[PDB]
Amino acid sequence: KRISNCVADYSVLYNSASFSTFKCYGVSPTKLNDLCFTNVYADSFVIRG
């Protein structure tokens, strides 16, 4: 799914403890709120653990 033309508040996503794994490889989650992007690609799927 292509996300564009909006404001993303990743702080709530990070603050949700329901996520077992969260890893950002080119950025830090804290800095995300202060960093603007061109466009985002949310790719979803279900995998084995």
Binding site: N15, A17, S20, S28, P29, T30
Partner: protein
């Protein structure tokens, strides 16, 4: 699960509200399960964060 937030350079609600290590930490971390020692079926709510 928080046993990973303990290591230096980490971040999270534990690392941002209650207990935070330094980036240059020099020392040794030791951890062992104490479920049988300090857990009850009804919920040992004596441990807060």
């Amino acid at each position: 699960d928080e046993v990973r937030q303990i290591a230096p350079g980490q971040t999270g609600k534990i690392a941002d509200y209650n207990y935070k290590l330094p980036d240059d930490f020099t020392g040794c971390v030791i951890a062992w399960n104490s479920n049988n020692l300090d857990s009850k079926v009804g919920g040992n709510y004596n441990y807060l964060y």
